[PDB]
Design a protein around this ligand. Structure first.
Ligand SMILES: Nc1ncnc2c1ncn2[C@@H]1O[C@H](C[C@@H](N)CC[C@H](N)C(=O)O)[C@@H](O)[C@H]1O
Length: 249
DNA sequence: TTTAAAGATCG
DNA sequence: ACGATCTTTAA
Protein backbone atom coordinates (compact mmCIF):
# COMPACT_ATOMS: atom_id res chain seq x y z
CA UNK A 1 0.00 0.00 0.00
CA UNK A 2 1.43 3.34 -1.13
CA UNK A 3 0.55 6.39 0.95
CA UNK A 4 0.08 9.78 -0.71
CA UNK A 5 2.38 12.62 0.33
CA UNK A 6 -0.63 14.80 1.15
CA UNK A 7 -3.15 14.69 3.98
CA UNK A 8 -6.51 14.75 2.21
CA UNK A 9 -10.19 14.10 2.90
CA UNK A 10 -11.53 10.81 1.57
CA UNK A 11 -8.15 9.07 1.51
CA UNK A 12 -9.93 5.78 0.84
CA UNK A 13 -6.92 3.75 1.99
CA UNK A 14 -8.87 0.96 3.71
CA UNK A 15 -11.17 0.84 0.67
CA UNK A 16 -8.27 0.21 -1.74
CA UNK A 17 -8.62 -3.54 -1.19
CA UNK A 18 -12.27 -3.46 -2.25
CA UNK A 19 -11.82 -0.93 -5.06
CA UNK A 20 -9.07 -2.77 -6.97
CA UNK A 21 -11.23 -5.90 -6.85
CA UNK A 22 -14.22 -4.26 -8.53
CA UNK A 23 -12.15 -2.00 -10.79
CA UNK A 24 -12.14 -3.24 -14.42
CA UNK A 25 -8.88 -3.71 -16.33
CA UNK A 26 -7.92 -1.34 -19.14
CA UNK A 27 -5.24 0.89 -20.64
CA UNK A 28 -6.11 4.29 -19.17
CA UNK A 29 -7.55 5.25 -15.79
CA UNK A 30 -9.59 8.43 -15.47
CA UNK A 31 -10.10 10.00 -12.04
CA UNK A 32 -12.32 13.12 -12.04
CA UNK A 33 -11.69 13.47 -8.30
CA UNK A 34 -8.03 12.50 -7.91
CA UNK A 35 -7.47 14.30 -4.59
CA UNK A 36 -4.54 12.63 -2.84
CA UNK A 37 -4.47 10.06 -5.64
CA UNK A 38 -4.46 6.98 -3.41
CA UNK A 39 -6.14 4.90 -6.12
CA UNK A 40 -3.69 6.22 -8.71
CA UNK A 41 -0.72 5.30 -6.52
CA UNK A 42 -1.92 1.79 -5.69
CA UNK A 43 -2.85 0.62 -9.19
CA UNK A 44 -0.92 -0.17 -12.37
CA UNK A 45 -2.34 1.26 -15.60
CA UNK A 46 -0.56 2.19 -18.82
CA UNK A 47 -1.82 5.78 -18.65
CA UNK A 48 -3.68 7.99 -16.19
CA UNK A 49 -5.98 10.97 -16.66
CA UNK A 50 -6.12 12.66 -13.26
CA UNK A 51 -8.28 15.71 -12.66
CA UNK A 52 -9.49 17.88 -9.78
CA UNK A 53 -11.29 21.20 -9.31
CA UNK A 54 -8.50 22.39 -7.00
CA UNK A 55 -6.02 24.49 -8.97
CA UNK A 56 -3.40 24.50 -6.21
CA UNK A 57 -3.58 20.71 -5.98
CA UNK A 58 -3.14 20.20 -9.72
CA UNK A 59 -0.37 22.80 -9.96
CA UNK A 60 1.55 20.99 -7.22
CA UNK A 61 1.32 17.65 -9.04
CA UNK A 62 2.91 19.15 -12.16
CA UNK A 63 5.71 20.83 -10.19
CA UNK A 64 6.56 17.57 -8.42
CA UNK A 65 6.40 15.68 -11.73
CA UNK A 66 8.46 18.04 -13.88
CA UNK A 67 10.84 19.45 -11.27
CA UNK A 68 11.21 16.61 -8.76
CA UNK A 69 14.78 16.91 -7.43
CA UNK A 70 14.47 20.69 -7.36
CA UNK A 71 11.20 20.60 -5.41
CA UNK A 72 12.21 17.98 -2.84
CA UNK A 73 15.28 19.94 -1.73
CA UNK A 74 13.39 23.23 -1.51
CA UNK A 75 10.51 21.61 0.38
CA UNK A 76 12.75 19.76 2.84
CA UNK A 77 13.94 23.10 4.12
CA UNK A 78 10.57 23.86 5.59
CA UNK A 79 10.34 20.65 7.56
CA UNK A 80 12.63 21.65 10.40
CA UNK A 81 11.96 22.06 14.11
CA UNK A 82 12.24 25.85 13.82
CA UNK A 83 9.18 26.07 11.57
CA UNK A 84 6.94 24.20 14.01
CA UNK A 85 5.30 27.17 15.72
CA UNK A 86 2.35 29.53 15.24
CA UNK A 87 4.29 32.70 14.40
CA UNK A 88 6.24 31.08 11.55
CA UNK A 89 3.23 29.13 10.24
CA UNK A 90 0.96 32.14 9.72
CA UNK A 91 3.73 34.00 7.91
CA UNK A 92 4.23 31.01 5.61
CA UNK A 93 0.46 30.88 5.12
CA UNK A 94 0.54 34.58 4.27
CA UNK A 95 3.46 34.17 1.86
CA UNK A 96 1.52 31.40 0.13
CA UNK A 97 -1.56 33.58 -0.33
CA UNK A 98 0.52 36.46 -1.70
CA UNK A 99 2.92 34.46 -3.89
CA UNK A 100 2.64 34.61 -7.68
CA UNK A 101 5.26 31.90 -8.23
CA UNK A 102 3.76 28.42 -8.86
CA UNK A 103 6.94 26.74 -7.57
CA UNK A 104 7.05 28.67 -4.29
CA UNK A 105 3.31 28.12 -3.83
CA UNK A 106 3.84 24.40 -4.39
CA UNK A 107 6.61 24.24 -1.79
CA UNK A 108 4.56 26.06 0.85
CA UNK A 109 1.48 23.98 0.01
CA UNK A 110 3.13 20.80 1.30
CA UNK A 111 4.17 22.64 4.46
CA UNK A 112 0.68 24.00 5.07
CA UNK A 113 -0.79 20.54 4.57
CA UNK A 114 1.53 18.88 7.09
CA UNK A 115 1.65 21.67 9.67
CA UNK A 116 -1.93 22.87 9.24
CA UNK A 117 -4.92 21.88 11.35
CA UNK A 118 -5.95 18.27 10.63
CA UNK A 119 -4.53 18.54 7.11
CA UNK A 120 -7.60 20.52 6.06
CA UNK A 121 -7.77 22.47 2.81
CA UNK A 122 -10.04 25.46 3.41
CA UNK A 123 -10.33 28.70 1.43
CA UNK A 124 -12.33 31.89 1.78
CA UNK A 125 -14.16 33.52 -1.11
CA UNK A 126 -10.98 35.46 -1.89
CA UNK A 127 -9.28 32.14 -2.64
CA UNK A 128 -7.04 32.52 0.39
CA UNK A 129 -5.86 29.55 2.47
CA UNK A 130 -7.16 30.12 6.01
CA UNK A 131 -6.46 26.92 7.95
CA UNK A 132 -5.03 27.59 11.45
CA UNK A 133 -1.88 26.10 13.00
CA UNK A 134 -2.01 22.36 13.65
CA UNK A 135 0.43 22.15 16.57
CA UNK A 136 1.81 18.67 15.93
CA UNK A 137 4.74 17.12 17.81
CA UNK A 138 6.81 16.39 14.70
CA UNK A 139 5.36 16.72 11.17
CA UNK A 140 6.66 14.08 8.75
CA UNK A 141 8.36 14.99 5.46
CA UNK A 142 7.16 12.46 2.85
CA UNK A 143 10.41 12.29 0.86
CA UNK A 144 9.91 8.65 -0.14
CA UNK A 145 6.25 9.28 -0.99
CA UNK A 146 7.22 12.25 -3.16
CA UNK A 147 9.75 10.39 -5.31
CA UNK A 148 7.32 7.48 -5.71
CA UNK A 149 4.65 9.92 -6.89
CA UNK A 150 6.99 11.58 -9.39
CA UNK A 151 8.17 8.33 -10.96
CA UNK A 152 4.56 7.22 -11.35
CA UNK A 153 3.24 10.56 -12.60
CA UNK A 154 5.26 10.10 -15.80
CA UNK A 155 2.38 8.02 -17.15
CA UNK A 156 -0.24 10.52 -16.01
CA UNK A 157 -1.88 13.74 -17.19
CA UNK A 158 -3.08 16.36 -14.71
CA UNK A 159 -5.98 18.71 -15.46
CA UNK A 160 -7.77 21.36 -13.42
CA UNK A 161 -11.42 21.04 -14.41
CA UNK A 162 -14.84 19.86 -13.24
CA UNK A 163 -15.84 16.19 -13.34
CA UNK A 164 -18.06 16.69 -16.40
CA UNK A 165 -15.14 17.85 -18.56
CA UNK A 166 -12.65 15.23 -17.38
CA UNK A 167 -15.05 12.34 -17.96
CA UNK A 168 -15.41 13.54 -21.55
CA UNK A 169 -11.77 12.54 -22.07
CA UNK A 170 -12.68 8.89 -21.48
CA UNK A 171 -12.50 6.46 -24.39
CA UNK A 172 -12.50 2.74 -25.26
CA UNK A 173 -9.10 2.05 -23.69
CA UNK A 174 -10.04 4.09 -20.61
CA UNK A 175 -11.56 2.98 -17.31
CA UNK A 176 -13.23 5.55 -15.06
CA UNK A 177 -13.20 5.68 -11.26
CA UNK A 178 -15.29 8.38 -9.58
CA UNK A 179 -14.78 9.36 -5.95
CA UNK A 180 -17.08 12.38 -5.46
CA UNK A 181 -17.45 14.34 -2.20
CA UNK A 182 -19.37 12.29 0.38
CA UNK A 183 -23.16 12.31 0.12
CA UNK A 184 -25.09 14.04 2.94
CA UNK A 185 -26.06 11.69 5.78
CA UNK A 186 -28.83 14.01 6.98
CA UNK A 187 -19.89 22.62 -1.96
CA UNK A 188 -20.98 19.54 -3.91
CA UNK A 189 -24.74 19.81 -4.42
CA UNK A 190 -27.25 16.97 -4.81
CA UNK A 191 -27.77 17.89 -8.46
CA UNK A 192 -24.07 17.33 -9.16
CA UNK A 193 -24.35 14.02 -7.32
CA UNK A 194 -27.17 12.92 -9.62
CA UNK A 195 -25.51 14.47 -12.68
CA UNK A 196 -22.50 12.24 -12.03
CA UNK A 197 -24.80 9.23 -12.32
CA UNK A 198 -26.15 10.53 -15.63
CA UNK A 199 -22.70 10.75 -17.24
CA UNK A 200 -21.70 7.35 -15.83
CA UNK A 201 -24.62 5.70 -17.62
CA UNK A 202 -23.91 7.65 -20.79
CA UNK A 203 -20.37 6.29 -20.71
CA UNK A 204 -21.31 2.67 -20.03
CA UNK A 205 -23.66 2.97 -23.01
CA UNK A 206 -20.56 3.83 -25.04
CA UNK A 207 -18.88 0.64 -23.77
CA UNK A 208 -16.85 2.47 -21.11
CA UNK A 209 -16.60 0.99 -17.58
CA UNK A 210 -17.25 3.38 -14.67
CA UNK A 211 -16.78 2.71 -10.95
CA UNK A 212 -18.22 5.06 -8.32
CA UNK A 213 -17.51 5.07 -4.58
CA UNK A 214 -19.75 6.83 -2.06
CA UNK A 215 -21.61 6.45 1.25
CA UNK A 216 -24.47 4.01 1.78
CA UNK A 217 -27.64 6.09 2.08
CA UNK A 218 -31.15 6.12 0.60
CA UNK A 219 -30.14 8.80 -1.91
CA UNK A 220 -27.05 6.97 -3.15
CA UNK A 221 -29.09 3.92 -4.13
CA UNK A 222 -31.61 6.13 -5.95
CA UNK A 223 -28.82 7.63 -8.04
CA UNK A 224 -26.78 4.51 -8.61
CA UNK A 225 -29.62 2.15 -9.34
CA UNK A 226 -28.47 1.29 -12.84
CA UNK A 227 -25.16 -0.11 -11.52
CA UNK A 228 -24.19 -3.36 -9.82
CA UNK A 229 -24.18 -2.13 -6.23
CA UNK A 230 -21.67 -3.68 -3.84
CA UNK A 231 -21.41 -2.77 -0.16
CA UNK A 232 -18.54 -2.84 2.35
CA UNK A 233 -19.29 -3.03 6.07
CA UNK A 234 -17.11 -0.32 7.59
CA UNK A 235 -19.80 0.63 10.12
CA UNK A 236 -18.06 3.57 11.78
CA UNK A 237 -18.65 7.21 12.77
CA UNK A 238 -25.01 6.02 13.55
CA UNK A 239 -23.09 3.29 11.73
CA UNK A 240 -22.83 4.13 8.02
CA UNK A 241 -21.27 1.97 5.30
CA UNK A 242 -19.59 2.66 1.95
CA UNK A 243 -21.27 1.93 -1.38
CA UNK A 244 -19.61 0.84 -4.62
CA UNK A 245 -21.36 1.50 -7.94
CA UNK A 246 -19.97 -0.42 -10.91
CA UNK A 247 -21.09 0.24 -14.49
CA UNK A 248 -20.03 -2.71 -16.65
CA UNK A 249 -21.06 -2.68 -20.34
C1' DT B 1 -29.84 54.39 7.08
C1' DT B 2 -33.30 50.61 9.21
C1' DT B 3 -34.14 45.79 9.96
C1' DA B 4 -33.86 40.68 10.59
C1' DA B 5 -32.23 36.64 8.71
C1' DA B 6 -28.56 34.31 6.55
C1' DG B 7 -23.96 33.60 4.96
C1' DA B 8 -19.01 34.14 5.61
C1' DT B 9 -14.80 34.19 8.59
C1' DC B 10 -11.20 31.65 11.05
C1' DG B 11 -9.10 30.27 15.17
C1' DA C 1 -18.98 20.38 14.01
C1' DC C 2 -18.01 24.87 16.87
C1' DG C 3 -18.91 30.06 17.64
C1' DA C 4 -18.04 35.05 18.30
C1' DT C 5 -17.74 38.54 14.85
C1' DC C 6 -18.30 40.82 10.19
C1' DT C 7 -20.53 40.84 5.80
C1' DT C 8 -24.35 40.09 2.72
C1' DT C 9 -29.20 40.24 1.01
C1' DA C 10 -33.59 42.72 0.02
C1' DA C 11 -37.77 45.31 1.17
N1 LIG D 1 -17.11 19.52 -9.29
C1 LIG D 1 -15.89 18.86 -8.91
N2 LIG D 1 -15.30 18.37 -10.02
C2 LIG D 1 -14.13 17.70 -9.92
N3 LIG D 1 -13.55 17.53 -8.70
C3 LIG D 1 -14.14 18.04 -7.58
C4 LIG D 1 -15.30 18.70 -7.68
N4 LIG D 1 -15.68 19.08 -6.43
C5 LIG D 1 -14.73 18.66 -5.56
N5 LIG D 1 -13.78 18.01 -6.26
C6 LIG D 1 -12.59 17.39 -5.75
O1 LIG D 1 -12.87 15.84 -5.45
C7 LIG D 1 -12.13 15.50 -4.43
C8 LIG D 1 -13.02 14.81 -3.35
C9 LIG D 1 -12.17 13.83 -2.50
N6 LIG D 1 -13.02 13.10 -1.62
C10 LIG D 1 -11.45 12.88 -3.39
C11 LIG D 1 -10.64 11.93 -2.54
C12 LIG D 1 -9.65 11.16 -3.41
N7 LIG D 1 -10.24 9.98 -3.88
C13 LIG D 1 -8.43 10.82 -2.60
O2 LIG D 1 -7.92 9.65 -2.67
O3 LIG D 1 -7.91 11.69 -1.86
C14 LIG D 1 -11.53 16.79 -3.87
O4 LIG D 1 -10.19 16.83 -4.13
C15 LIG D 1 -12.25 17.92 -4.62
O5 LIG D 1 -11.31 19.08 -4.85
Amino acid sequence: KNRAFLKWAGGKYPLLDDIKRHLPKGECLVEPFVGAGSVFLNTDFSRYILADINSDLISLYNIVKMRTDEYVQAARELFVPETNCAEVYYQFREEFNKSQDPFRRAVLFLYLNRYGYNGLCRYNLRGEFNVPFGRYKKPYFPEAELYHFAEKAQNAFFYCESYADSMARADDSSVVYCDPPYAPLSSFTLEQQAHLAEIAEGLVERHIPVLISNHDTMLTREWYQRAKLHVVKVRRSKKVDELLALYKP
